[PDB]
Write a protein that binds this ligand. Structure first.
Ligand code: HEC
Ligand code: HEC
Ligand code: HEM
Ligand code: HEM
Ligand code: HEM
Ligand code: HEM
Ligand SMILES: CCCCCCCCO[C@@H]1O[C@H](CO)[C@@H](O)[C@H](O)[C@H]1O
Ligand SMILES: CCCCCCCCO[C@@H]1O[C@H](CO)[C@@H](O)[C@H](O)[C@H]1O
Ligand code: FES
Ligand code: FES
Ligand SMILES: [Sr+2]
Ligand SMILES: [Sr+2]
Ligand SMILES: [Sr+2]
Ligand SMILES: [Sr+2]
Lengths: 256, 429, 179, 429, 256, 179
């Protein structure tokens, strides 16, 4: 495989003061339920977090109503039942569809110049920015080298890297000539496939951005709490450092 | 023993305690040992390591109150901490990045010892005690990376049992013993968890000997000149007590270190990690872009540098009648990097302690500092050309520095005169 | 000098706050997580519970007793006077906390036939043996030897209070709603 | 400090080490400390405790390589050890009965201290240090008993959180904090396992201070006469070195202890246990015939002896306006049994050290030994009559011995003249 | 409840030199499969142990054939399948029927004179001897105090103690007057209910003893290794104790 | 005197033997238990595997590769000579251990279309990447950089030997028996 390029998205959560857009996560939640949930699942995400702070923050009744659409096999009884807020999202309905719980942190969107991590140091891991590129990275037609040579059951994506490539597209010494590769996921986003609550734009780029934000929140629900605590510890230890500096400075005066 | 002054019980309670258990006396004699007054900022890493060891153990014990060592629940139990346990997201990132802070410390702490010749006598015991601490840390820190049971975690565990599995003859037996079965399974995770809890306490025990070791002899200093012990008044000119002069200085630097460190944990907790460990373990698929932690990459390069076509490997193969293959040679090279570093008190024959006044040693040291960093950098790179040869030059220079250069250096050295006393260096500056 | 002694206190205070601010995260982690905080009510089908049969159901980690009391079990509660009882509080979440520990205040119906209460001994949280056990024709705790009557009130033993009664109510003729 | 003789480096290697880290000197001074030569068979229990603590830790680490701290898998993971792990059946029974051996040891070790006045000065530090070890041992052994997750395991865990739940006002909050929820659940089992791993290391750390405590002051002896310290040759008449005379004697007794202990583990590993712990945990049903471990029964009796109708309880109840109920009073009595035993250096006012030469003290002491056994025996018995009052009479004498009798005894004692020196007692024997 | 009397059985495994009778456990296995298995299960016992040493020690082919009769839900696949030797015996088919894996060690058959543990010290825990008493402790008619008052669905057993008892059978101060109590298990053993391979006697007393031994092996499969190892450890420490004594005796000879 | 010094040797030996007999159980416990020892054979349904598609199946905890090789892959294997190979041993459990590492000795059928081998890198046990990868049109190991040819033979990298071939045989036209 490899590590290539990505479309840089100014997500709201990016940056030291970045925070989730509450309406965006509700939009991304809708995209997941209506499109992605048909094949994918989130075996690790509790449904109750849709009302927890630093997230979509829905009313508990909407979470209660939203959870009922999912079927859950009771751990004790054994017979299926309606979904409660205490249950997790179901397993991936499609066997070979990976789980989307930690996808926004399990993929790197940026790669250091010479594997030096300089790009990641300034741009981040790039998970939510990589998902946006895969959804919007399905071209109309394949590359010319593959016309009449596509592996059956796969689709070309610019941003996907772990996919097969026809031998007719490889050069003389085995290196692939295409930017991307052939992914097994059909194009999941089609223009205006979803109608949002707040009437927000539902383009392919918009849905990818919205669902990426929701997919980032699913992977790291406590991001907004972490940055509050981090800034506090930074501010506090700075005070401790400043006082320790003046204390250390005055103590050595009585020697030299 | 440096000339200090005994502890004298002052109050009545101190007299009551001192005639039964002189715990206040041992603390006074320890914490008031005379320390050279010319120590620079490179002598802080000992205190930072002490804090880090407390940090990992304290946070680690907490994490054991929610972790479940089982393949079906391990990866899930970590996400339980991240999502539901109050403040659990901070504790994992603290314990995770804390190991990275705990490992940038030792290398700066070690390179300090290599530069200033704190491994040369009478400080051999401090070095050897340190090397045992290092070995425990490396094995300890790895097994913690096995516990989340991600993709990176699973196949790493397969490697280590293979490393002991690479020994001729007895390797396959040891590999089964380490694995508890044909392959990495539940028996492997459960035992690695037990040792990850144990060894940090063994590390703490070594740190006590490490602390006792340098207190008996005295802290080295940038000049390398030992403290004068002819009188209490002469030592006071070359030295100050450990408390309060250098305790506050180290605590001050600790706050600056923690200031930088907490910003990492607070704003980029995953930059120092690898994203592939957020994927559940798959016994049927290995990741394409394996990268171990940065504190294992230099040993990752050595394991891959010695392929079957390396010239040095081919010579060893014939001499041993085929026993020493590329696999076994790579393991010997990886652990051999410790052995040459562990034996450095008996390879450096120069009688000058501090490397500040050794001009020729300085070049090879800074190359070694670049070499260790370069070794780390190639660990993330693919094995293809030209990276294949770069890792071999770096690996070769590592053994050349310890086994070839340092023995030769002690003879042809043209040292520079150190100052007459620590006071001369302190007062001139 | 305010610039002098202040520094030798703020530095110690910052260290004290640092120890305190570093210890508080380590303590709060042991508190219950979000998965346990969000438990909710349940519904029990008591259609086939004859008089004298006790039905034990789990709720919030603990057992809840649901006994259809017999003719005799009802009287033993109503014969005891408030002065004879160790605890004069009903310990019931439905009625007010100040309510008296009468047998009609320990059951759901005026006939006193259905007794619903936490199966949690108020001493240290064991499960009293059901049926007709102990020295008062009620419940007997085997952990330390606490005896309760047929109405679920403490009469003898280390336990200070009566067995608490959860928020319970009949939602229809044949179903109970706990919590 | 007793007059011993310094350590002199003999070989060349010993000289090389002694100038860097004097571990051989500290080891020589430690293991060659002068010990009284009149010790009888009752001075073995200190060494027996050392083996047991090592045995539990060594076997414990092994058991942690196959145990799973999870309610759905804990009890199952134990039966995996019993049936499938090679030799796992012997190791579990060793860790279980080993704790029972570890607890008959402390009581014989403790009753030794009570008879011979090893708690009186200058040995307060050794005694109080011992009490902290005892609390850790008691807390440690319980949390280990929770781990198999049988019927006894589950409801034992419910009780202890209730004991901290018995504190007025803040108790109910603390009970949730200890439990991690409304009731005993996975959060409780997982944390009890973590602390059960931690505290044995904390116990080991305390034992070091415990060992250091008596080396500074010196071992007590049956006569109570202090060692002569006016000259090295007078001490040599009153004392012999610890090694090899008492190391081999204690090691001999250890082998006899292990002989008895392995026959238990070899032929009746379950006689000292309770069969109810072989039943899977049932949160909805408690067993009818609960019996804690024999080393917890005496404190189990005290907890039940003070019911709500005891006259003394009603006095405290009225004085405190109902605050001090039966629940809170019973917990204070249980914990109070430790506190009165810890404070015995300041309650025994007799200036005679050894109880061998105190005729009235002998009577009251042997009653306490019977009292402890009676307390232990009644804990397994049903609460009905007459066991309720017997445990109350027995409970009353416990506090009377420390708080009432020993202060009173120091005045009306008619002591007997001790020997002039330790040598005098040895020659008659 | 309480702790009463029991019929003392000289089981072969009792005693320092006791060992399992290989043929006896095969009979007990037959009794379990044909009678007890209808309601009870052994969720902890691996099926493979029916050929392991220190047990019934059947040929692996017979175990392979024996294991196939059980249905097992594959942990991974999910679809049911035939039972393998690697799987455990099934859960208890009857909900309120306790698991018999550790029953032979979870019940005490003996009780000290006045709760002093002297009887257990000389007779053992008594688990396998208590099971024999429950199976053989079903009388023809109930006690006279209970004649015409049996709870429907329960049966009187002399040795069972944790069962309910009618109030008509208790004395003046609440204590039950009957030796036993009412258990919910119908008498499972009927004379000659099982036909053995070698034509061995199939009385009620014989089947109860045989299945009790099988239940002891199920609870403690490694008993025969423990007593050999225990005796071994005794021999070493005995030698070590003796030598340490002689060393201690000669070492102390030069003082007194 | 043989009666004198001898005792101060046997006493240490008995303690040493006691220590040794008590230490060996603590080591042997880590060996595999009975639940893992009793794994057995499996059956794979290769009915719908077209040429070029690889089928990975779990067996004894590790992956087994089942690739139906393409037209180009088969000849590429047969083009390599025994002298050109790093390892001349076939490492095959069916045929004898001394068999040569020819392409015809690495497959089950004489046509060389079905290749069945352990998906266990002989270096340290990783899973080589399938399809057509590496510098020899075969398998590439991402752990340390081992390159295999289209027949599954090692050509370059730290790995000493070829990928082992399990005891495998076709029981019928469309089913493989592993183990
Ligand atoms: C079935 C009709 C699908 C729907 C609807 C969605 N996805 Fe999917 N996805 C599907 C398959 C079969 C696969 C496996 C691809 C492979 O090569 O094996 C995937 C994979 C993904 C991935 C992983 C990309 C990677 O780097 O490996 C992502 C990030 C992903 N899918 C995202 C995604 C989103 C956001 C969707 C809703 C907008 C969505 N998928 C729908 C099948 C299907
Ligand atoms: C259904 C027809 C059963 C068969 C066949 C067997 N047993 Fe049973 N058993 C059954 C029930 C419903 C119960 C619960 C009893 C209760 O009071 O709750 C039991 C219980 C036991 C016990 C436990 C006794 C105790 O001390 O609690 C034992 C030891 C026992 N059963 C043994 C046993 C044996 C050996 C059987 C085959 C010969 C057997 N049972 C068959 C229901 C049924
Ligand atoms: C938990 C890990 C460690 C801790 C807490 C620790 C702590 C300390 C401390 C407090 C000192 C005194 C001077 C100073 O602070 O720098 C010291 C010195 C030293 N340490 Fe460490 N150390 C650790 C690991 C190591 C390791 C792994 C090595 C080498 C492999 C090492 C080598 C040295 C040396 C050479 C000295 C100088 C001794 C002297 O000057 O007399 N240390 N260490
Ligand atoms: C003292 C040196 C220690 C080091 C260097 C260390 C290092 C690590 C590392 C690198 C991880 C992986 C983190 C991740 O992948 O997110 C980890 C995980 C873990 N460690 Fe440690 N550890 C130490 C001590 C301890 C101790 C004493 C405990 C006591 C219980 C402990 C318990 C755990 C647990 C439970 C995990 C898994 C949970 C998690 O990853 O957050 N560790 N450790
Ligand atoms: C792990 C638990 C313990 C161990 C390993 C231990 C070990 C020792 C040792 C080696 C000694 C030296 C003399 C002797 O061997 O008897 C000693 C003395 C003593 N111990 Fe302990 N002990 C433990 C617990 C306790 C406890 C719980 C107490 C009291 C509550 C206690 C009270 C004493 C006293 C009073 C002495 C005599 C000190 C003297 O004569 O100076 N010990 N112990
Ligand atoms: C003073 C030291 C210790 C004491 C007194 C002690 C005591 C106990 C006791 C009484 C049990 C219950 C046994 C049963 O119910 O069958 C137990 C279980 C257990 N202990 Fe410990 N323990 C100690 C140290 C340790 C250590 C250091 C570890 C781990 C490194 C450990 C790990 C375990 C485990 C895993 C169990 C559950 C498995 C079993 O019961 O066999 N223990 N312990
Ligand atoms: C050396 C100390 C540096 C402190 C950490 C730098 C934090 C700035 O780094 C940025 O943090 C953002 C906050 O999450 C991330 O979104 C960005 O990806 C990361 O680049
Ligand atoms: C104090 C040391 C006593 C050693 C243990 C006594 C062993 C005798 O005790 C008997 O052992 C038999 C053999 O295991 C068991 O079958 C019996 O149940 C047990 O009572
Ligand atoms: S726990 Fe119920 S009376 Fe003590
Ligand atoms: S593990 Fe495959 S080449 Fe190293
Ligand atoms: Sr961006
Ligand atoms: Sr060449
Ligand atoms: Sr009264
Ligand atoms: Sr018998």
């Amino acid at each position: 495989a490899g590590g290539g390029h990505v479309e840089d998205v100014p997500f709201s959560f990016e940056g030291p003061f970045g925070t989730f857009d509450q309406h965006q996560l509700q939009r991304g939640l809708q995209v997941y339920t209506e499109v992605c949930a048909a094949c994918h699942g989130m075996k690790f995400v509790p449904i109750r977090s849709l009302s927890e702070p630093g997230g979509p923050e829905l009313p508990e009744d909407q979470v209660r109503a939203y959870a009922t659409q999912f079927t859950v096999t009771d751990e004790e009884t054994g017979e299926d039942r309606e979904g409660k807020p205490t249950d997790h999202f179901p397993h991936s309905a499609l066997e070979n569809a990976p789980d989307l719980s930690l996808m926004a942190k399990a993929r790197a969107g940026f790669h250091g110049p010479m594997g030096t991590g300089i790009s990641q140091l300034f741009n981040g891991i790039g998970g939510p920015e990589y998902i946006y590129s895969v959804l919007t990275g399905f071209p109309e037609e394949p590359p010319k080298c593959a016309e009449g040579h596509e592996p059956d059951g796969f689709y070309y994506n610019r941003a996907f890297q772990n996919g097969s490539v026809p031998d007719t597209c490889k050069d003389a010494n085995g290196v692939k000539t295409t930017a991307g590769s052939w992914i097994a996921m059909p194009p999941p986003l089609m223009d205006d496939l979803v109608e949002y609550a707040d009437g927000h734009d539902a383009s392919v780029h918009a849905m990818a951005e919205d669902v990426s934000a929701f997919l980032m929140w699913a992977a790291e629900p406590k991001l907004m709490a972490r940055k509050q605590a981090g800034f506090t510890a930074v501010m506090f230890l700075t005070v401790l450092s400043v006082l320790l500096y003046l204390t250390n400075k005055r103590l050595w005066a009585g020697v030299k | 023993g440096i000339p200090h002054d005994h502890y004298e019980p002052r109050t009545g309670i101190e007299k009551w305690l001192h005639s039964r258990l002189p715990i206040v006396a041992l603390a006074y004699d320890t914490i008031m040992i005379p320390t050279p007054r010319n120590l620079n900022w490179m002598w802080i890493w000992g205190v930072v390591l002490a804090f880090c060891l407390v940090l990992q153990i304290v946070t680690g014990i907490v994490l054991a109150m929610h972790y479940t060592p089982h393949v079906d629940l391990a990866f899930a139990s970590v996400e339980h901490i991240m999502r539901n346990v109050n403040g659990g997201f901070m504790l994992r990132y603290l314990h995770a990045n804390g190991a990275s802070l705990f490992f940038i410390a030792v290398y700066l702490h070690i390179f300090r010892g290599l530069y200033y010749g704190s491994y040369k006598a009478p400080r051999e015991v401090t070095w050897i005690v340190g090397m045992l601490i290092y070995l425990a840390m490396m094995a300890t820190a790895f097994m913690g990376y096995v516990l989340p049971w991600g993709q990176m975690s699973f196949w790493g565990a397969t490697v280590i049992t293979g490393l002991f599995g690479a020994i001729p003859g007895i390797g396959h037996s040891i590999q089964t013993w380490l694995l508890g079965g044909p392959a990495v399974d539940n028996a492997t995770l459960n035992r690695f968890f037990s040792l990850h809890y144990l060894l940090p306490f063994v590390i703490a025990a070594l740190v006590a000997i490490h602390i006792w070791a340098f207190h008996s002899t005295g802290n080295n200093n940038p000049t390398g000149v030992e403290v004068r012990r002819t009188s209490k008044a002469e030592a006071q000119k070359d030295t100050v007590p450990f408390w309060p002069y250098f305790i506050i200085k180290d605590v001050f630097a600790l706050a600056v270190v923690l200031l930088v460190f907490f910003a990492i944990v607070g704003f980029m907790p995953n930059y120092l990690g690898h994203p592939d460990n957020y994927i559940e373990a798959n016994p049927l698929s290995t990741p394409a872009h394996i990268v171990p932690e940065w504190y294992f990459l230099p040993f990752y390069a050595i394991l891959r540098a010695f392929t079957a076509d390396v010239w040095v490997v081919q010579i060893a193969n014939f001499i041993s009648f085929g026993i020493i293959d590329a696999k076994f040679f790579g393991v010997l090279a990886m652990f051999g990097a410790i052995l040459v570093m562990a034996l450095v008190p008996w390879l450096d024959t120069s009688p000058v302690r501090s490397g500040r006044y050794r001009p020729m040693f300085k070049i090879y040291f800074w190359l070694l500092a670049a070499d260790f960093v370069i070794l780390t950098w190639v660990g993330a790179q693919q094995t293809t050309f030209p990276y294949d040869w770069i890792s071999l030059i770096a690996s070769a220079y590592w053994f050349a520095y310890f086994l070839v250069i340092l023995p030769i250096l002690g003879a042809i050295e043209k040292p520079v005169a150190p100052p007459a006393t620590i006071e001369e260096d302190f007062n001139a500056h | 000098g305010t610039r002098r002694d202040f520094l030798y206190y703020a530095t110690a205070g910052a260290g004290a706050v640092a120890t305190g601010a570093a210890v508080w995260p380590l303590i709060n982690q042991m508190n219950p997580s979000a998965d346990v905080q969000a438990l909710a009510s349940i519904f029990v089908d008591v259609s086939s519970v004859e008089p004298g049969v006790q039905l034990t159901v789990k709720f919030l980690g603990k057992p809840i007793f649901i006994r259809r009391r017999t003719e005799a079990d009802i009287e033993l509660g109503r014969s005891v006077q408030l002065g004879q009882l160790v605890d004069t509080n009903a310990r019931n979440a439905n009625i007010d906390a100040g309510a008296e520990a009468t047998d009609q205040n320990r059951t759901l119906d005026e006939a006193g036939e259905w007794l619903v209460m936490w199966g949690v001994c108020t001493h240290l949280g064991c499960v009293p043996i059901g049926g007709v056990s102990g020295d008062f024709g009620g419940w007997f705790c085997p952990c330390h030897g606490s005896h309760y009557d047929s109405a679920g009130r403490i009469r003898k033993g280390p336990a200070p209070e009566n067995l608490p009664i959860p928020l319970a109510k009949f939602i229809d003729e044949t179903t109970i709603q706990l919590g």
